[PDB]
């Protein structure tokens, strides 16, 4: 099984990882980002990721 936690977007600090809504959460307090968990961009809740 092992643990997992994200590299934050921007910091790159352990974010709180939330697998169960493909979510992140900074740990940082002057940075505190909100990021989708398979594209490392700004949350989109429901909708699909995006290529480049
Ligand atoms: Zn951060
Ligand atoms: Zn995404």
């Known amino acids: 099984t092992d ?3 994200k590299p934050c977007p ?3 600090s352990p974010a709180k990882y939330q697998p169960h ?12 980002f909100d990021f989708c968990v ?5 949350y989109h809740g429901s909708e699909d990721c995006r290529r480049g």
Do not use: D, V
């Open 21 to 32: 809504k493909k979510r992140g959460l900074c740990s940082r307090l002057a940075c505190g």
């Open 10 to 12: 921007r910091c790159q």
């Open 3 to 5: 643990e997992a936690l």
């Open 38 to 42: 398979l594209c490392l961009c700004a």
